[PDB]
Amino acid sequence: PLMVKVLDAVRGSPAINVAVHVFRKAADDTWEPFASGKTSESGELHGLTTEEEFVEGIYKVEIDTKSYWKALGISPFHEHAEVVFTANDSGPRRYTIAALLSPYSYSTTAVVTN
Amino acid sequence: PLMVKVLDAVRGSPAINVAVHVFRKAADDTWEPFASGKTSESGELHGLTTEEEFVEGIYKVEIDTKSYWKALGISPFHEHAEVVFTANDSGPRRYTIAALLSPYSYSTTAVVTN
Amino acid sequence: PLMVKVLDAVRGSPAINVAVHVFRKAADDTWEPFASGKTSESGELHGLTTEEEFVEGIYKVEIDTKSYWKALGISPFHEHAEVVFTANDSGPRRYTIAALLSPYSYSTTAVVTNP
Amino acid sequence: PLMVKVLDAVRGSPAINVAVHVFRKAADDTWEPFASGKTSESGELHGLTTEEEFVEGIYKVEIDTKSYWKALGISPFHEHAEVVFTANDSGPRRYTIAALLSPYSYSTTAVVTNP
Numbered sequence: 479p480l481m482v483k484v485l486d487a488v489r490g491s492p493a494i495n496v497a498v499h500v501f502r503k504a505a506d507d508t509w510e511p512f513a514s515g516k517t518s519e520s521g522e523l524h525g526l527t528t529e530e531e532f533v534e535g536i537y538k539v540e541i542d543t544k545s546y547w548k549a550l551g552i553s554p555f556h557e558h559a560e561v562v563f564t565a566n567d568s569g570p571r572r573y574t575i576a577a578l579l580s581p582y583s584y585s586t587t588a589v590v591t592n
Numbered sequence: 593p594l595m596v597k598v599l600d601a602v603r604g605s606p607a608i609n610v611a612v613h614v615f616r617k618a619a620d621d622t623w624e625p626f627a628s629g630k631t632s633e634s635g636e637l638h639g640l641t642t643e644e645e646f647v648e649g650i651y652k653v654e655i656d657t658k659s660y661w662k663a664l665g666i667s668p669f670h671e672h673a674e675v676v677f678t679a680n681d682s683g684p685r686r687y688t689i690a691a692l693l694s695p696y697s698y699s700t701t702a703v704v705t706n
Numbered sequence: 707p708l709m710v711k712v713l714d715a716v717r718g719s720p721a722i723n724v725a726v727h728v729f730r731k732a733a734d735d736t737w738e739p740f741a742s743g744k745t746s747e748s749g750e751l752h753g754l755t756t757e758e759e760f761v762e763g764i765y766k767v768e769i770d771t772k773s774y775w776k777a778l779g780i781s782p783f784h785e786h787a788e789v790v791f792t793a794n795d796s797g798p799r800r801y802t803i804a805a806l807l808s809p810y811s812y813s814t815t816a817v818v819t820n821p
Numbered sequence: 822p823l824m825v826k827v828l829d830a831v832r833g834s835p836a837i838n839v840a841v842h843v844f845r846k847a848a849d850d851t852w853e854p855f856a857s858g859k860t861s862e863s864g865e866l867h868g869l870t871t872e873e874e875f876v877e878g879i880y881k882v883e884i885d886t887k888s889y890w891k892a893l894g895i896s897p898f899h900e901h902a903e904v905v906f907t908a909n910d911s912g913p914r915r916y917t918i919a920a921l922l923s924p925y926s927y928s929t930t931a932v933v934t935n936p
């Protein structure tokens with residue numbers, strides 16, 4: 479129900495081995511850990527959650543862009559890229575959070591399909 | 593060897609049934625038709641060419657964004673989106689041209705892999 | 707030393723009256739409110755801070771994109787757009803944080819200049 | 822009435838000394854040269870045309886991104902970035918064509934205002 483795809487605008491490639499952490503907003507307005515992983519060779523992270531666990535709520539997808547750039551020997555601007563959104567049941571069911579990274583910039587979009 | 597993927601930033605969806613025309617630059621500096629199609633339900637166009645036909649050269653991928661927006665009853669800015677690039681054999685072999693569309697803006701990137 | 711510029715990719719216009727909240731990470735790892743404002747008719751927000759006040763640190767610029775889209779009567783995807791960065795750690799710089807907004811997407815960039 | 826602004830997503834800076842060529846589609850469907858220039862130290866190019874000269878038509882703004890990246894000794898993907906649009910067809914407008922450049926990617930947006 480939740481996939482993350484990360485691309486590198488400098489090299490024209492998937493962004494491989496990027497750490498991604500997903501959080502769900504709690505009752506008390508704190509962010510609790512939900513799911514995490516590292517992007518694959520294709521820049522994707524699947525298997526984060528199941529339909530059962532992925533209930534409506536506010537989620538945060540934190541992409542560790544700073545470590546990615548440092549590993550390539552490049553100095554970046556951002557600490558991370560943050561994507562914060564509400565999951566809504568009356569919308570389509572599958573969510574892809576995509577991000578396109580540069581050292582001083584990033585783009586993100588949502589592809590929400592049935 | 594050549595794929596095109598188009599996404600809609602307004603609706604958060606693949607951009608379906610978008611016309612795409614690919615041209616190769618000729619000897620005489622004109623653009624000759626090479627391949628075309630319409631994006632699928634997943635916003636993708638595959639099957640444009642074969643390894644045999646896709647030789648080094650300058651290519652132009654023209655995405656008919658104006659018709660896409662008009663079909664959705666939205667007034668757009670651009671006539672089309674143009675992506676012009678050199679195919680180079682010493683680089684990886686598979687090229688994905690991706691575009692993310694809004695009515696007054698678009699993003700494009702290349703994912704070139706082996 | 708800190709300016710924010712926001713554009714609307716749907717309308718082809720500045721994004722006007724966008725709320726922006728800036729935080730700075732404290733010693734204790736909490737996010738302390740630092741400054742806030744709204745974009746002008748030109749999509750810009752100046753006057754957030756001073757060179758004296760804008761010390762080294764980790765800053766978070768939260769752009770209230772959901773409130774913007776909803777005020778236009780549109781239902782967007784994201785809650786906000788958050789831009790988090792270390793500033794002034796090699797001395798004072800001038801930062802422009804720019805953002806380009808669509809209902810299901812945004813991009814952001816930084817322009818950093820050394821006065 | 823026509824301005825071009827270019828930023829560099831790698832450096833976090835204006836994209837300086839970027840060549841830009843503007844064409845206008847002629848009666849005979851050819852692209853006629855209209856104006857040209859280079860971005861300044863601020864990444865901007867003004868002075869391309871006048872309200873008198875900038876009549877209705879289909880315009881192409883070609884941003885010479887390959888020449889920019891190569892002048893910095895980098896091998897980029899795209900030949901250029903081309904922005905094609907109808908202008909002034911409901912009367913005179915002011916157009917800003919903005920672009921944000923990376924070696925394998927770019928984004929472009931338009932800001933259109935009615936003076």
Ligand SMILES: Nc1cccc(/C=C/c2cc(Br)c(N)c(Br)c2)c1
Nearest residue numbers: 576578585586587690692699700701
């Ligand atoms: N599923 C799939 C497969 C291959 C490529 C993509 C690209 C997504 C994507 C995201 C952002 Br953000 C921008 N700006 C761009 Br242009 C493209 C998606």
Ligand SMILES: Nc1cccc(/C=C/c2cc(Br)c(N)c(Br)c2)c1
Nearest residue numbers: 804806813814815919921928929930
């Ligand atoms: N007028 C003005 C002054 C200073 C900065 C800007 C930035 C514009 C801009 C264009 C694109 Br294309 C993207 N993706 C992003 Br983000 C921002 C505009």
